[PDB]
Amino acid sequence: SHMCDAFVGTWKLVSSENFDDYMKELGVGFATRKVAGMAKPNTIISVNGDVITLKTESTFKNTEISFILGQEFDEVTADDRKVKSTITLDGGVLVHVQKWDGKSTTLKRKREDDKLVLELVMKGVTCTRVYERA
Ligand SMILES: Cc1nc2ccc(Cl)cc2c(-c2ccccc2)c1C(=O)O
């Protein structure tokens, strides 16, 4: 067992705040924002030894990343940014930093009651995405 086990499971999006605004900060175009913003993704988190995998399934895009904490990796994001990512565990929060073209965004995941809360921050804009177990 590991602390990261509180994250493992299948999670369904149940609420969103400021996603469209967050996407505008990322430079996502109109059509992509509209389609992405309509999606009700599920996220599947699993752990196998030191490897964590985060898989998103949706009607917009399906993505999968696997990584080791603290070890940089290449990621092509759902909106087709090519980024360098590093994911750490900081006091129980999964912290994911994406770097591309001199820009940065941070995605934090935390357990809160029976929910998994994803916070996406770009510049002054915070989006909150709340999931429950599927
Ligand atoms: C973490 C992440 N970051 C994003 C950044 C930008 C855009 Cl456009 C989309 C995402 C998505 C996503 C949202 C809806 C459907 C599918 C994927 C997610 C994700 O939940 O997996």
PDB file of C-alpha atoms and ligand atoms in Angstrom:
ATOM      1  CA  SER A   1       0.000   0.000   0.000  1.00  0.00           C
ATOM      2  CA  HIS A   2       0.834   3.590  -0.674  1.00  0.00           C
ATOM      3  CA  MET A   3      -0.629   6.963   0.174  1.00  0.00           C
ATOM      4  CA  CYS A   4      -1.300   7.494  -3.655  1.00  0.00           C
ATOM      5  CA  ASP A   5      -3.862   4.661  -3.356  1.00  0.00           C
ATOM      6  CA  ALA A   6      -6.559   7.298  -2.232  1.00  0.00           C
ATOM      7  CA  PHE A   7      -6.486   8.487  -5.796  1.00  0.00           C
ATOM      8  CA  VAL A   8      -6.849   5.105  -7.491  1.00  0.00           C
ATOM      9  CA  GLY A   9     -10.171   4.400  -9.128  1.00  0.00           C
ATOM     10  CA  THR A  10     -12.616   5.578 -11.761  1.00  0.00           C
ATOM     11  CA  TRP A  11     -13.772   9.154 -11.371  1.00  0.00           C
ATOM     12  CA  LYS A  12     -16.566  10.959 -13.203  1.00  0.00           C
ATOM     13  CA  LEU A  13     -16.722  14.755 -13.587  1.00  0.00           C
ATOM     14  CA  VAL A  14     -19.622  16.252 -11.655  1.00  0.00           C
ATOM     15  CA  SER A  15     -18.976  19.977 -11.668  1.00  0.00           C
ATOM     16  CA  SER A  16     -16.801  22.618 -13.322  1.00  0.00           C
ATOM     17  CA  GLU A  17     -15.987  26.291 -12.706  1.00  0.00           C
ATOM     18  CA  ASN A  18     -14.008  28.556 -14.965  1.00  0.00           C
ATOM     19  CA  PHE A  19     -12.902  25.914 -17.433  1.00  0.00           C
ATOM     20  CA  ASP A  20     -13.670  28.052 -20.482  1.00  0.00           C
ATOM     21  CA  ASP A  21     -11.647  30.921 -18.950  1.00  0.00           C
ATOM     22  CA  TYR A  22      -8.774  28.577 -18.092  1.00  0.00           C
ATOM     23  CA  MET A  23      -8.778  27.277 -21.679  1.00  0.00           C
ATOM     24  CA  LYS A  24      -8.671  30.867 -23.023  1.00  0.00           C
ATOM     25  CA  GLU A  25      -5.447  31.380 -20.910  1.00  0.00           C
ATOM     26  CA  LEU A  26      -3.985  28.277 -22.536  1.00  0.00           C
ATOM     27  CA  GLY A  27      -4.659  29.730 -25.967  1.00  0.00           C
ATOM     28  CA  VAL A  28      -7.324  27.196 -26.862  1.00  0.00           C
ATOM     29  CA  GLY A  29      -9.393  28.266 -29.873  1.00  0.00           C
ATOM     30  CA  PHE A  30     -13.136  28.785 -29.939  1.00  0.00           C
ATOM     31  CA  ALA A  31     -14.281  25.489 -31.532  1.00  0.00           C
ATOM     32  CA  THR A  32     -12.051  23.350 -29.334  1.00  0.00           C
ATOM     33  CA  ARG A  33     -13.209  25.218 -26.231  1.00  0.00           C
ATOM     34  CA  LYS A  34     -16.821  24.673 -27.041  1.00  0.00           C
ATOM     35  CA  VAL A  35     -16.434  20.922 -27.633  1.00  0.00           C
ATOM     36  CA  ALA A  36     -14.038  20.394 -24.702  1.00  0.00           C
ATOM     37  CA  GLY A  37     -16.247  22.404 -22.369  1.00  0.00           C
ATOM     38  CA  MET A  38     -19.258  20.180 -23.139  1.00  0.00           C
ATOM     39  CA  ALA A  39     -17.389  16.990 -22.266  1.00  0.00           C
ATOM     40  CA  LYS A  40     -18.151  14.998 -19.106  1.00  0.00           C
ATOM     41  CA  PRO A  41     -14.856  13.081 -18.840  1.00  0.00           C
ATOM     42  CA  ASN A  42     -14.024  10.150 -16.692  1.00  0.00           C
ATOM     43  CA  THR A  43     -10.564   9.707 -15.308  1.00  0.00           C
ATOM     44  CA  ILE A  44      -9.090   6.336 -14.366  1.00  0.00           C
ATOM     45  CA  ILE A  45      -6.106   6.451 -12.005  1.00  0.00           C
ATOM     46  CA  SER A  46      -4.026   3.361 -11.367  1.00  0.00           C
ATOM     47  CA  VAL A  47      -0.743   2.520  -9.773  1.00  0.00           C
ATOM     48  CA  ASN A  48       1.620  -0.310 -10.644  1.00  0.00           C
ATOM     49  CA  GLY A  49       4.806  -0.247  -8.636  1.00  0.00           C
ATOM     50  CA  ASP A  50       6.282   3.194  -9.093  1.00  0.00           C
ATOM     51  CA  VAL A  51       4.310   3.882 -12.275  1.00  0.00           C
ATOM     52  CA  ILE A  52       1.110   5.932 -12.006  1.00  0.00           C
ATOM     53  CA  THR A  53      -1.279   6.100 -14.941  1.00  0.00           C
ATOM     54  CA  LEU A  54      -3.967   8.715 -15.514  1.00  0.00           C
ATOM     55  CA  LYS A  55      -6.359   7.914 -18.293  1.00  0.00           C
ATOM     56  CA  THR A  56      -9.149  10.239 -19.435  1.00  0.00           C
ATOM     57  CA  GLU A  57     -12.028   9.046 -21.509  1.00  0.00           C
ATOM     58  CA  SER A  58     -14.529  11.445 -23.074  1.00  0.00           C
ATOM     59  CA  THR A  59     -16.465  12.259 -26.203  1.00  0.00           C
ATOM     60  CA  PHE A  60     -13.936  15.122 -26.868  1.00  0.00           C
ATOM     61  CA  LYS A  61     -10.632  13.238 -26.553  1.00  0.00           C
ATOM     62  CA  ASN A  62      -9.171  10.208 -24.863  1.00  0.00           C
ATOM     63  CA  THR A  63      -5.716  10.599 -23.282  1.00  0.00           C
ATOM     64  CA  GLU A  64      -3.408   8.454 -21.196  1.00  0.00           C
ATOM     65  CA  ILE A  65      -0.224   9.412 -19.316  1.00  0.00           C
ATOM     66  CA  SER A  66       2.054   7.175 -17.315  1.00  0.00           C
ATOM     67  CA  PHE A  67       4.844   8.518 -15.172  1.00  0.00           C
ATOM     68  CA  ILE A  68       7.134   8.231 -12.102  1.00  0.00           C
ATOM     69  CA  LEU A  69       6.918  10.918  -9.475  1.00  0.00           C
ATOM     70  CA  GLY A  70       9.581  13.515  -9.948  1.00  0.00           C
ATOM     71  CA  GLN A  71      10.681  12.320 -13.384  1.00  0.00           C
ATOM     72  CA  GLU A  72      10.059  14.577 -16.375  1.00  0.00           C
ATOM     73  CA  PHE A  73       8.125  13.304 -19.323  1.00  0.00           C
ATOM     74  CA  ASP A  74       6.750  14.415 -22.714  1.00  0.00           C
ATOM     75  CA  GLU A  75       3.025  14.930 -22.904  1.00  0.00           C
ATOM     76  CA  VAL A  76       0.689  15.858 -25.812  1.00  0.00           C
ATOM     77  CA  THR A  77      -2.255  17.417 -24.073  1.00  0.00           C
ATOM     78  CA  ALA A  78      -5.918  17.107 -25.074  1.00  0.00           C
ATOM     79  CA  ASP A  79      -5.699  20.520 -26.797  1.00  0.00           C
ATOM     80  CA  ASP A  80      -2.512  19.431 -28.610  1.00  0.00           C
ATOM     81  CA  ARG A  81       0.090  21.300 -26.659  1.00  0.00           C
ATOM     82  CA  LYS A  82       3.463  19.539 -26.661  1.00  0.00           C
ATOM     83  CA  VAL A  83       4.628  20.027 -23.053  1.00  0.00           C
ATOM     84  CA  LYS A  84       7.278  18.885 -20.624  1.00  0.00           C
ATOM     85  CA  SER A  85       5.561  17.599 -17.486  1.00  0.00           C
ATOM     86  CA  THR A  86       6.673  16.644 -14.041  1.00  0.00           C
ATOM     87  CA  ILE A  87       4.284  15.217 -11.425  1.00  0.00           C
ATOM     88  CA  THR A  88       5.149  15.139  -7.633  1.00  0.00           C
ATOM     89  CA  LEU A  89       3.265  14.319  -4.416  1.00  0.00           C
ATOM     90  CA  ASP A  90       3.285  17.211  -2.092  1.00  0.00           C
ATOM     91  CA  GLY A  91       1.622  16.636   1.258  1.00  0.00           C
ATOM     92  CA  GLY A  92      -0.980  14.419  -0.188  1.00  0.00           C
ATOM     93  CA  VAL A  93      -1.656  16.586  -3.311  1.00  0.00           C
ATOM     94  CA  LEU A  94      -0.654  15.314  -6.793  1.00  0.00           C
ATOM     95  CA  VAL A  95       1.016  18.338  -8.376  1.00  0.00           C
ATOM     96  CA  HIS A  96       1.489  18.355 -12.171  1.00  0.00           C
ATOM     97  CA  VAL A  97       3.452  21.149 -13.828  1.00  0.00           C
ATOM     98  CA  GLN A  98       3.379  21.529 -17.649  1.00  0.00           C
ATOM     99  CA  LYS A  99       5.973  23.738 -19.413  1.00  0.00           C
ATOM    100  CA  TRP A 100       5.845  24.754 -23.085  1.00  0.00           C
ATOM    101  CA  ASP A 101       6.933  27.810 -25.131  1.00  0.00           C
ATOM    102  CA  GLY A 102       8.122  29.617 -21.972  1.00  0.00           C
ATOM    103  CA  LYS A 103       4.651  29.194 -20.346  1.00  0.00           C
ATOM    104  CA  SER A 104       3.576  27.076 -17.401  1.00  0.00           C
ATOM    105  CA  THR A 105       0.322  25.666 -15.968  1.00  0.00           C
ATOM    106  CA  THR A 106      -0.189  23.646 -12.814  1.00  0.00           C
ATOM    107  CA  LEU A 107      -2.779  20.968 -12.242  1.00  0.00           C
ATOM    108  CA  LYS A 108      -3.335  19.828  -8.678  1.00  0.00           C
ATOM    109  CA  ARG A 109      -5.419  16.858  -7.567  1.00  0.00           C
ATOM    110  CA  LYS A 110      -6.529  16.318  -3.947  1.00  0.00           C
ATOM    111  CA  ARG A 111      -9.047  14.125  -2.119  1.00  0.00           C
ATOM    112  CA  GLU A 112     -11.777  16.123  -0.304  1.00  0.00           C
ATOM    113  CA  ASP A 113     -14.448  14.017   1.393  1.00  0.00           C
ATOM    114  CA  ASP A 114     -15.599  11.461  -1.225  1.00  0.00           C
ATOM    115  CA  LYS A 115     -14.537  13.712  -4.102  1.00  0.00           C
ATOM    116  CA  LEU A 116     -11.397  14.206  -6.133  1.00  0.00           C
ATOM    117  CA  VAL A 117     -10.832  17.888  -6.812  1.00  0.00           C
ATOM    118  CA  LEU A 118      -8.698  18.970  -9.805  1.00  0.00           C
ATOM    119  CA  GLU A 119      -7.483  22.606  -9.748  1.00  0.00           C
ATOM    120  CA  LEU A 120      -6.020  23.992 -13.014  1.00  0.00           C
ATOM    121  CA  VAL A 121      -4.161  27.333 -12.744  1.00  0.00           C
ATOM    122  CA  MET A 122      -2.831  29.464 -15.562  1.00  0.00           C
ATOM    123  CA  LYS A 123      -1.706  32.977 -14.745  1.00  0.00           C
ATOM    124  CA  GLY A 124      -4.480  34.482 -12.498  1.00  0.00           C
ATOM    125  CA  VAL A 125      -7.129  31.967 -13.617  1.00  0.00           C
ATOM    126  CA  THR A 126      -8.150  29.027 -11.434  1.00  0.00           C
ATOM    127  CA  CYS A 127     -10.477  26.343 -12.741  1.00  0.00           C
ATOM    128  CA  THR A 128     -11.992  23.817 -10.343  1.00  0.00           C
ATOM    129  CA  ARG A 129     -13.169  20.416 -11.659  1.00  0.00           C
ATOM    130  CA  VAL A 130     -14.904  18.106  -9.103  1.00  0.00           C
ATOM    131  CA  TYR A 131     -15.131  14.336  -9.612  1.00  0.00           C
ATOM    132  CA  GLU A 132     -16.970  11.550  -7.790  1.00  0.00           C
ATOM    133  CA  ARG A 133     -16.365   7.909  -7.924  1.00  0.00           C
ATOM    134  CA  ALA A 134     -18.047   6.331 -10.989  1.00  0.00           C
TER     135      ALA A 134
HETATM  136  C1  LIG B   1      -6.288  17.414 -17.188  1.00  0.00           C
HETATM  137  C2  LIG B   1      -6.937  17.962 -18.469  1.00  0.00           C
HETATM  138  N1  LIG B   1      -6.484  19.085 -18.967  1.00  0.00           N
HETATM  139  C3  LIG B   1      -7.072  19.655 -20.056  1.00  0.00           C
HETATM  140  C4  LIG B   1      -6.545  20.845 -20.671  1.00  0.00           C
HETATM  141  C5  LIG B   1      -7.129  21.415 -21.781  1.00  0.00           C
HETATM  142  C6  LIG B   1      -8.242  20.798 -22.416  1.00  0.00           C
HETATM  143 CL1  LIG B   1      -8.894  21.506 -23.855  1.00  0.00          CL
HETATM  144  C7  LIG B   1      -8.763  19.683 -21.847  1.00  0.00           C
HETATM  145  C8  LIG B   1      -8.196  19.071 -20.697  1.00  0.00           C
HETATM  146  C9  LIG B   1      -8.718  17.813 -20.175  1.00  0.00           C
HETATM  147  C10 LIG B   1      -9.922  17.204 -20.787  1.00  0.00           C
HETATM  148  C11 LIG B   1     -11.149  17.857 -20.555  1.00  0.00           C
HETATM  149  C12 LIG B   1     -12.313  17.293 -21.086  1.00  0.00           C
HETATM  150  C13 LIG B   1     -12.260  16.154 -21.832  1.00  0.00           C
HETATM  151  C14 LIG B   1     -11.055  15.515 -22.056  1.00  0.00           C
HETATM  152  C15 LIG B   1      -9.892  16.040 -21.567  1.00  0.00           C
HETATM  153  C16 LIG B   1      -8.114  17.350 -19.001  1.00  0.00           C
HETATM  154  C17 LIG B   1      -8.511  16.050 -18.442  1.00  0.00           C
HETATM  155  O1  LIG B   1      -9.528  16.017 -17.612  1.00  0.00           O
HETATM  156  O2  LIG B   1      -8.005  14.939 -18.687  1.00  0.00           O
END
